[PDB]
Amino acid sequence: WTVDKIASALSVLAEEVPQNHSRLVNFLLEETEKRAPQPRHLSKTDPFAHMKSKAIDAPEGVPTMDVKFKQHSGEYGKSRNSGRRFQYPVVCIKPDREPVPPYRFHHAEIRKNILALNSQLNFVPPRSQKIAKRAQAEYAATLAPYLEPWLRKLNIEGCTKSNLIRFMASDMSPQAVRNASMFTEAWDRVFNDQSKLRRVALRDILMLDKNVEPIFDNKRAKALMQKVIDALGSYTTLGCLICFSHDCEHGEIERDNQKRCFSLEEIGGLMPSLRRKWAAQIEQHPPCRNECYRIHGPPWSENEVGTLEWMFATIGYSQTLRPECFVGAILGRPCWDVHRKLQELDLPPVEIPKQKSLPWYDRRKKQLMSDWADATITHEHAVRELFAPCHHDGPCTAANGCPCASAGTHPVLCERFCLCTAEECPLKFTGCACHSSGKTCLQRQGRPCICVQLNRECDPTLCKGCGARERADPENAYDEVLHSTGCQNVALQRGAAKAVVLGKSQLEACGYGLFAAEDIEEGEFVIEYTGELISHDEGVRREHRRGDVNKVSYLFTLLEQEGIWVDAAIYGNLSRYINHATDGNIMPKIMYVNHEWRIKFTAIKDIKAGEELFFNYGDNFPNLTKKLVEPLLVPKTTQPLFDPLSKVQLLPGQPLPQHPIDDSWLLLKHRDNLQDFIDLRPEEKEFLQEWDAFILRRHISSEQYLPRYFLRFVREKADWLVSKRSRGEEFSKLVATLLARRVLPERVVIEATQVLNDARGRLRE
Amino acid sequence: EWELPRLRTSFIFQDDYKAEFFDVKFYPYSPPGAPPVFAATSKKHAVICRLTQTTDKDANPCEIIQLIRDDGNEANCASCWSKDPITDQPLLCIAGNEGNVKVYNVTEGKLYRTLVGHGGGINDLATSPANPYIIASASDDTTIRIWSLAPEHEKQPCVCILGGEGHSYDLLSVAFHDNGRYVLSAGHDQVINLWALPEFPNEHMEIPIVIYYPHFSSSEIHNNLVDCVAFYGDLILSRACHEDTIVLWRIEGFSSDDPIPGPLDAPTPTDMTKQTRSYFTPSRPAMFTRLAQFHTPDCGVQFFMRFRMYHVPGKHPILAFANAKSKTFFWDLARFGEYARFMADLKEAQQSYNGRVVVVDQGQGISLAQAQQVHGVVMKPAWLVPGFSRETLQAWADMYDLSNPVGLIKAHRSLAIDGAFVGRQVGWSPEGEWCVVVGNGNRALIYQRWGKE
Ligand SMILES: CC[C@H](C)n1cc(C)c2c(C(=O)NCc3c(C)cc(C)[nH]c3=O)cc(-c3ccc(N4CCNCC4)nc3)cc21
Ligand SMILES: [Zn+2]
Ligand SMILES: [Zn+2]
Ligand SMILES: [Zn+2]
Ligand SMILES: [Zn+2]
Ligand SMILES: [Zn+2]
Ligand SMILES: [Zn+2]
Ligand SMILES: [Zn+2]
Ligand SMILES: [Zn+2]
């Protein structure tokens, strides 16, 4: 062969492309023409039959309009006269309703902040390259189906799709690679003429190959203990420490939209947490309904032995929990079976420096003293940067590279996810000391509440005297009697807002405003400001794409130094309608809430139902681009009120619309995100997505509530979990990961064993 | 039956924005062969004419039978037709820059109701072919609202909002598929979206259903703002500013014989660099295919100019559009195949007969039989005007060849218009014998075919 002879051949095979196209376009036109639809819903009678020309002949006080007509004839459209003019009376019809105040986008409600990807700036209220690329891509899609039937027709030695893919990333016979080259150019000669914009390099066609393409799809997820680490890889890498979902709102979006999950690998992976559990264990029941090893005592797949391996490592040196009953219920084996396998297997050795206690903070009395405001930046959120929780082996000192003591301008306290303990580390946060049969953890308190002073809400787990454990449980959000005493500083986790209603704002300047639908007393939490969490450049890009570059963009600063803003333009809640006033009746505050940062509004005056809410915007909404160039019922009001969803007008006195928050679209997004990984097998995605669809709906902030929700999941999905080997195995890895974290108590692994065995025996039908 | 329209009547309606006609639609619910009646919408008025064919060339076929003024503050630019669900009398919906749809009882000249809820001006309106009580509004607030005029929905007539992030700027065009469950939307953000509506309950709806994801979404068919979009069967016609083409194209894997996907079947934007995503897709394939581009020279920088296909059983599909320089263009879609057949018979006869081939005009008193008796004989359609010269063959290709998806199909009929005229909208009578083009200067151009003069 010669480059010119094959280019000659391609040129004659190319002849089928336009004639096939003409065949296709012509075929679809005739199918469409013959499938044309018959007009429906005709009336039995002509409804205009009784209506005459309304033209006037040579009225009184009736509006009138003129129309001059011309007639035309011939091929040229020439008129036959200068034309005739007529007058008609006019029927004037006024609308009976006024439009609602203006707005842009469909405003949807979210129960919590969602993490936004970064977008490309394509629309603003080089183009030359973008048109070029699209013309090429359209052409590559046209010719792609022709490559291999043409290679077949030509029958050129070495001219195979696999081998052109080889020559392009440049084993391939001598006259193979010769043909390879002669094919590549010639293709370019026939199809990549650099004069035309409708051109395509063969290389562009090969990159569309289903085996080639995932090479550039950057959606990648990630002794005896090396097997465990690897088996748990997907859970240690994706499992959120805050909320326990594998695709959630936490972690960090990098500029190319790669996510760093807020997961175990952020604090050293499995081992540093697991060694620590083993140690704590070192310094320290009923039989199952499946032929337990308590009472007694078919070849094994390597997956089944792996399953028992990691469950044995993860359970660890436990005193009242053992792998047998749980592994057994995971496989289909009697508890003695795995006991036999376990004993047949015979499955590392386990290894506190006194520190100068800090005078500004006593972690045993739960108290800040003296200089503390000047000593630390734990409480000042606008200057904080987000560092992975410390997982070093030493005391938290600048010497061991502890970011908590050293990464910031001042030391911050170690939090619940730091691998230190309160006994080792004088920086460890221990919750507040408040307790009271009355109200406690207030602003203006004997001793004050250390959680309030640190501008954080109480921790369900560590704040054990104030009753935070119960009052931060959303399931008791409407127990008014509960919340009338005890901890008064978990309003954001309580998740219950004051009754509010959308309306037309009283200000002759604003559109919508938000109005109180109940009485609010000074000091009460009103609402959270939710929205999309975005980066600095994402805010800049959005200010452009919305024509803001007269302020039209509002981007609540959540963490100034870290660079996170909250944009409620599309997703958020009714707080996005609160108007500005220099003397407002509410006030925002940024609060640390279980390692989330969040925005609450608290009333600063007494607001009666029907009154509008205002706050002083202050510097909360910087102009990012310009900084860079340098019985609940509708109240009676004067303003009209609207349903937030339908925008129908509310009747003052009617029942406040309480619409259940619709999140199916958000679960979809998260389901699809895990499905995108080339890194995950179908059986991992299947279970991960199932767990995430349940746990996301629960909006977990605290390990306090994980055991309960975990148990409600094993019970709603027990049938599903036993139907298919891979599902139980993947469930087993989840619980392995959660037990290595000491976040799942032994009491729920046992209750899960019983829930599973009952579903499995129930299936033995 | 191969006949294309001629100008028969024009008129100028007095200036009422002191001014354009922005919409024209013939009433579609009249019993077969009833006099066609259309409404033309200016910024303040709906002009409603009956058209009646005439033996007299100087008779005025047009009768203005109703003239309604929007007595509020709105300037309108969109209309569509519906019916009273109880009485069956015609309802005209008019919408404009305040964000409200007015529904008019036009035979009685009364307000039927107002449709309130958009946060910005409405630029387009469309009735579902499957249900005459279902209306779709496209708005500057970037959403589509689906409204129902059925009795069960009177206390809350918004049954659906197409929201989410599929659109980010003002919408100019909304269109229904004939099955009534697929909606096309497009506008200034250059995104064309296809949404699948759910079935809506036969009862009161406290809140409309919200859809957050289109099932097909692309910004890559055009390189500019898209101001008009329509289904042609399951194919798609769309037009953008600056391009001087109407593009026929196809979503890969889309068929209306397949079951209708639900909301959670929609693709979600997981890769922020992809400018096309689609539920319907089957080497990576195109998710869409450009089929053909009708050439509409001289639209300039004008936008908000709409085309209309005439598409009815047993009659030729006709694409009509008027540009921004006083020209109205027509394409007969059945000519495309007729041309392909005649050119097929031609080459097959030039090979079997060494060039001894004789072309003959059909539609005379002839038959390819009376043609064969006189001596290969090839039947040429009468509307194919000039072995043939090269210029003749190029002139024929330019109008009729569908071999190049980025070629440019020249109008089959180009009728000039007196004075400067920018076309905004085209509408066809039910039986296809009238075609009304409206546009600036409150002018209407009335084209006829199959007349009686
Ligand atoms: C240019 C578009 C830009 C991207 N953008 C983004 C948004 C969210 C938005 C909105 C909007 O959602 N508001 C509701 C609202 C909120 C959310 C909060 C408060 C306190 N209060 C409110 O009302 C409105 C407009 C807009 C356009 C024209 C207009 N007109 C007045 C007189 N000139 C002609 C028409 N007014 C408002 C633009 C918007
Ligand atoms: Zn999370
Ligand atoms: Zn047991
Ligand atoms: Zn440390
Ligand atoms: Zn630390
Ligand atoms: Zn520490
Ligand atoms: Zn306290
Ligand atoms: Zn506390
Ligand atoms: Zn407390």
Numbering used by the authors:
A (entry chain B): 197 to 254, 259 to 325, 360 to 404, 427 to 428, 430 to 479, 491 to 552, 567 to 579, 588 to 637, ...
B (entry chain A): 8 to 25, 38 to 301, 307 to 399, 404 to 414, 489 to 555
Q: What did the original publication write about this model?
A:
Polycomb Repressive Complex 2 (PRC2) is a histone methyltransferase complex composed of core subunits Ezh2 (or Ezh1), Eed, Suz12 and Rbbp4. PRC2 trimethylates histone H3K27 (H3K27me3) to mark developmentally repressed chromatin. Ezh2 contains a split catalytic region composed of the SET domain and the SET Activation Loop (SAL) but is inactive without minimally associating with Eed and the VEFS domain of Suz12 [Suz12(VEFS)]4–8. Pyridone inhibitors bind to Ezh2 in an extended pocket that overlaps with the SAM binding site.
The hydrophobic drug-binding pocket of Ezh2 is formed by residues P302, R304, F305 and H307 in the SAL domain, and Y809 and Y878 in the SET domain (magenta and blue sticks, respectively). Clear electron density was present for GSK126 in all regions except the sec-butyl “arm” group and the terminal piperazine ring of the “tail”, even though the drug molecule binds in a site that is less enclosed by the ctEzh2 residues compared to the human structure. The carbonyl and amine groups of the pyridone moiety of GSK126 mimic the carboxylate and amine of SAM to hydrogen bond to the backbone of Y809, directly competing with SAM binding in a manner similar to the human version. In the SAL domain, the imidazole nitrogen of residue H307 hydrogen bonds to the carbonyl on the linker between the pyridone and the indole moieties of the drug, and residue H307 itself is stabilized by hydrogen binding to the carbonyl oxygen of residue R304. The backbone amine of residue R304 also hydrogen bonds to the linker carboxyl oxygen in the “neck” region of the drug, whereas the side-chain of residue R304 undergoes a conformational change compared to the SAM-bound structure, and supports both the indole region of the body and the pyridine region of the tail of the drug via hydrophobic interactions. The side chain of residue P302 also provides additional support for the latter. The piperazine region points outward toward the solvent, similar as to the GSK126-bound human PRC2 structure. We then tested the inhibition of ctPRC2 by GSK126. In contrast to human PRC2, GSK126 was a very poor inhibitor of ctPRC2 with an IC50 value of about 100 μM (and protein purity in Fig. S2A). While residues 656–661 fold into a tight helix in human Ezh2 and residue Y661 cages the drug in the active site, the aligned region in ctEzh2 (residues 845–851) contains a partially disordered flexible loop (dotted line), that is located away from the drug.
